Amino acid sequence: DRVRSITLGNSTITTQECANVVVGYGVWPTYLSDHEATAVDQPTQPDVATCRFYTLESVKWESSSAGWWWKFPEALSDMGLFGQNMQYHYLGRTGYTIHVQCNASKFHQGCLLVVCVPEAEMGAATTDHAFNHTKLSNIGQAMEFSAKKSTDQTGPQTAVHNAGMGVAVGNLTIFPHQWINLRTNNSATIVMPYINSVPMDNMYRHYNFTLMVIPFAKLEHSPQASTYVPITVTVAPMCAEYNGLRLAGHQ
Amino acid sequence: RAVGRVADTVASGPVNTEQIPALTAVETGHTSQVVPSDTMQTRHVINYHTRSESSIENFMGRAACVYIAQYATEKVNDELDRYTNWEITTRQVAQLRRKLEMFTYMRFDLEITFVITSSQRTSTTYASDSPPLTHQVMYVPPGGPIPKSYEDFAWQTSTNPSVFWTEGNAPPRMSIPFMSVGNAYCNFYDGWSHFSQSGVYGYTTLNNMGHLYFRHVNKSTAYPVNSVARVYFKPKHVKAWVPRAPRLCPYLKARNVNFNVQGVTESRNKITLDRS
Amino acid sequence: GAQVSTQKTGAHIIHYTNINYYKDSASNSLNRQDFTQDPSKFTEPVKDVMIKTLPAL
Amino acid sequence: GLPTMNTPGSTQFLTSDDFQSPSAMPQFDVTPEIQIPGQVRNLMEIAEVDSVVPVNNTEGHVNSMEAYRIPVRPQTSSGEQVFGFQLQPGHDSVLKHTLLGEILNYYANWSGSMKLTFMYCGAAMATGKFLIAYSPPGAGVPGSRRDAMLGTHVIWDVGLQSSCVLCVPWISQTNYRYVTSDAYTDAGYITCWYQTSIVTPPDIPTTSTILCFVSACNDFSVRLLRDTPFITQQALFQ
Amino acid sequence: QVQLQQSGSELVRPGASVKLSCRASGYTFTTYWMHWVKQRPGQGLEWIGNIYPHSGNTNYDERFKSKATLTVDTSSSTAYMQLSSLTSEDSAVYYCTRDLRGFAYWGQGTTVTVSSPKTTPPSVYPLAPAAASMVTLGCLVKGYFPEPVTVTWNSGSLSSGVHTFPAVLQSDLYTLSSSVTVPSSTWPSETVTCNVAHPASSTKVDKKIVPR
Amino acid sequence: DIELTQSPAIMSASPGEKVTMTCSASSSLRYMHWYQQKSGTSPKRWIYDTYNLASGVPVRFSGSGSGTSYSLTISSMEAEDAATYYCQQWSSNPPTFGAGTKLELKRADAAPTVSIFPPSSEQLTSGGASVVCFLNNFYPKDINVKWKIDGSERQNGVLNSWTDQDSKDSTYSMSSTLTLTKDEYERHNSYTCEATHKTSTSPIVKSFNRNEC
Ligand SMILES: CCCCCCCCCCCCC/C=C/[C@H](O)[C@H](N)CO
């Protein structure tokens, strides 16, 4: 059906035009088991103070927009007690529920691709130059793709048809994805598990995945319609646990 | 029914139903499972085709050149000297790097073959009887003592593995186990080496596999001789996770994912086909 | 330890013998006869099952 | 001293052999594997996933997102053409760089049925009907909707379900076709036509957009591994 | 340890064939490249010539071609770097470095000038002031043609505050200065003297400083 | 085209700061060597193969550099780190490398003294004339000097000799001398020296005349 309710902690998301839920690679998030652990000490597991819906800021969809990206867990570093547990611990491990939501009327058109791309290592704009960590991910800010190519000396390459990775942007539909087609869709929901080559990892030096929202068909409407269409991203951690308690980082 | 064998097609007739296999919604992230037995009338075909060539072991299990080493019997500069080294990486050749970068994480054993040819350096005379040339390919694990020069003590290889090979025979070969400290080889790494998000960005900080040192074990020749050692890698017992989109742009560096901006495909003159 | 498998042959004397000579499993030959697959992780990664003949919404 | 005899083939290096070799690190303790999601066992699990096709690749639109957007508008007379390409999944410039195209370029043969999914991305108040056909190669490309209704077609009705699937069947005289296309293994043409029109209420933009997705059915296979003709280099990457 | 040093040459009567001597014996003999790095007083580091003992394949550099003969003699273990038909530009410190991966085993370097001058004696001249708790001193050496000079104060008993100045050449002659700090407890009580000696020209000049 | 040397000519750093290096080469490279030339003996080898090692180099030294730009960075300077650094590249016409990247140890800036020693009877008898003034124990290196006699300026025959960096105070000492003739010194009266520097406001003046013996 097209209705859906998601409850995580003291927060609830309601939806009346839902497509479906994409669950990762068929895997639901879960805790670590004893036959896959490496660290010996007991982990902490705050199940309701940390696994709840955290809403980021909004972006403005225009007829010239190229797309946006957020890198996780670094996009939720200032969000509540999820961000405070990242400061005091050496290792962390979590899955996510991403709910991207964009509403418009029956007289608007446009289509977004909402991918969750694991290990989206980005190539630099000025090749032969290393590039900063502030141009890759701020703490909650949405970084913007560009239509043409980027000539920044210390940033990544933001031409959206290459997706910043050297690939074709049309082939991004093997990562867990959903579309928001304004003719038929209101929001997109993707449930991501923990994907890594190690059972636990530092949540500061490493970006797990990158959520991109790319407009494939551009937003166009009548001039007498409503011109401000926002896109809002609500992310909830799932089954988050942390090892290695020490003083507050991060260096 | 055997495993690997593709599915047969069933016979179908005309329909007039409220069922709609063609009408779907790709907004759900779901690829439709429409077979030709849903939108037309088909016959019963028995399909004997098999997907044996498409397996990860068959697609990866060919030997590919990863490096071309160069060293001489007499030193002219550096390079080329009486010995040479190579930090082990699968990212200096374009053909195997693109085959490996279709997966995010991998796990395989390694079979390594060296094809070591040799040729006489340009001189005013070449008439000299030479004994058969012997080569050494020492593997230095990460952190071990590297040879500082020729005739160094580190070529005594008391714990480091090492192969000797005389020219004319079969190429040498040895197998390598899965050498990572984590549970899988990381083809990509969206992250930094330091916790302050500085230093080295990318997969370079994770690949630490040691060096590979080459030399001639013969002390000299009469006239100098250049030598080329080609390293061939074949993965085996392969596991692969999280498939990536294929690399479109040509590579530029062996330590970066950097690229120049390229079009998504090739261009044509118009969007329609026009003839009768 | 003579393992007798089936050779890869066409469709419409067919076996081979293998001995392992070394003590490490990294020293074996390739596993070229395993063709198992399940593409439903990538092609149908949904929460509620979508029937083919039914409407999608 | 067991008497043996050397057959032709000794002391050779064939790059596609299965022999055993002595380990360089003997009795090495490998780290135990964990359950990572998304394990790939076949390359055809990847090729069965939808990827959007750049049909509108007329220059210069290959350096933007205009390659993927197929423009449709209200017409003045019905029966016009929307797009058209030749069914060469590894050779045509429309289909060779998709997710199904980059896998076929590692091979020299291909066989099986393929799927074409089309997605109307216009307003919720605009209606339309289309005819997507597939013509086998014996008689050239069609030049009208009358020359294309005689082929293998389907009539898309745009409604609540925004997508429709043209399934291209396997019609050939050989079991396998060639990836680098020749005249002997021609696979045909794919065209799309206006069945009626796009009919919109007032205060709606005229030009609209269809996205097209390609994948493979459950009888698809490939053969004859080879190197891809897409990647290249002159010197070694330093 | 690689022994020992290199030897320096003086001004010769013109027309002869000059020849250095590098005593580089820490061998490890004999397959290596004795690359001869050169350096001017402008501190610029370029190369003069190399050799190979197994074959004889010598090399050179574009400024020192025609002719710099460097023949190998492994029984003497020496390496020569002098060039024939050279001009007066080669007043330079001459390194003779054996090889490793980099430039590891360098030489200590010998300075050799070449012209047609005459050896002139040094001239130790009085520097005394004509007012505080201390004073400076000095004795100028003016007009010595070859580069060896000597800076001595009181036969090595007041040798702490001796600031050593280089002799920039003007009109093809060297001019430096050599001072010392003298407190008022010893000025003008005791006799302070200096000596500039030229061993290439064999003359010793001693002067006792008395304030005017 | 085509010359190759280090990028900074004369730098200055105290023991306790960063020493990051930058060079230039006329041709590309794969390896890069870094050295240290101290005043008094031959230079030594510090970094080969862009990172590897040396015999006596401590752990604080680091290096890099590929192609046409080198970098031999010291993470922390100490008192034993005062030397000139040059590069290396073997060729096929070696480039050549630089002449050495000069540096001096930094401390509090010193103001000098100036002492004029008048020409005695032994120089005027022989046929010479030289009025001297010695600028010793100053910091940094740059000093504007000038020779003024009876009001007007003179720049012919002047000298600027430079001591090296000291081992005890690590300051400099300069000799500012002109040469004259026996009747050239007998046609002026007041021979002075002013040493202009940024430490003091006005340059220090010492004066003497000829009408006293
Ligand atoms: C003379 C004896 C030669 C023996 C050869 C030993 C070399 C074996 C070490 C290499 C093993 C790991 C190879 C690395 C694979 C890829 O780089 C990983 N995907 C990234 O780390």
Numbering used by the authors:
A (entry chain B): 11 to 261
B (entry chain A): 9 to 284
C (entry chain D): 2 to 13, 24 to 68
D (entry chain C): 1 to 238
E (entry chain H): 1 to 130, 135 to 216
F (entry chain L): 1 to 213
Text of the article:
The 6C5 Fab fragment binds to the E30 viral surface within the pentameric building blocks at a site near the fivefold axis. The position of this binding site is similar to those observed previously for 11G1 antibody bound to Enterovirus D68 (EVD68) and NAb 1D5 bound to Coxsackeivirus A6 (CVA6). Five 6C5 Fab molecules attach to the north rim of the canyon that constructs the “star-shaped” protrusions surrounding the mesa [see coordinated submission by Wang et al.15]. The interaction patch in 6C5 comprises all six complementary determining regions (CDRs): L1 (residue 30 and 31), L2 (residue 51), L3 (residue 90), H1 (residue 32 and 33), H2 (residue 54 and 55), H3 (residues 99-101) and the light chain framework region (LFR, residue 33 and 48). The epitope recognized by 6C5 contains 11 residues, primarily locating in the VP1 BC loop (E82, K83, V84, D86, E87, D89, Y91), VP1 DE loop (T130), VP1 EF loop (K156, E159), and the VP1 HI loop (T229). Tight bindings between the antibodies and E30 are chiefly due to extensive hydrophilic interactions, including hydrogen bonds and salt bridges. As a major structural marker, the VP1 BC loop not only contributes significantly to distinguishing E30 from other EV-Bs, but it is also the most divergent region with regards to primary sequence within EV-Bs. Overall, excluding 10% of the binding area contributed by conserved residues, the average conservation is only 26% in the 6C5 epitope. The specificity of VP1 BC loop both in sequence and configuration and it’s recognition by 6C5 explain the serotype-specificity of 6C5. For a relatively blunt antibody, the binding sites are usually outside the canyon – the “uncoating receptor” footprint, widely scattered in the most exposed regions with serotype-specific configurations, as those observed for E30 6C5, EV71 D6 and CVA6 1D5.
Echovirus 30 (E30), one serotype of the species EV-B, has emerged as one of the leading etiological agents of aseptic meningitis and caused extensive seasonal and periodical outbreaks throughout Europe, Asia and South America in recent years. Furthermore, E30 is reportedly associated with other diseases like viral encephalitis, acute flaccid paralysis, hepatitis, and even acute diarrhea. As with many other EV-Bs, E30 is believed to utilize two types of receptors to gain entry into host cells: CD55 for viral attachment; and FcRn for viral uncoating. Neutralizing antibodies could possibly target different steps of viral infection, including blocking viral attachment to the cellular receptor, interfering with viral uncoating via over-stabilizing or destabilizing the virus and physically damaging and/or aggregating the virus.
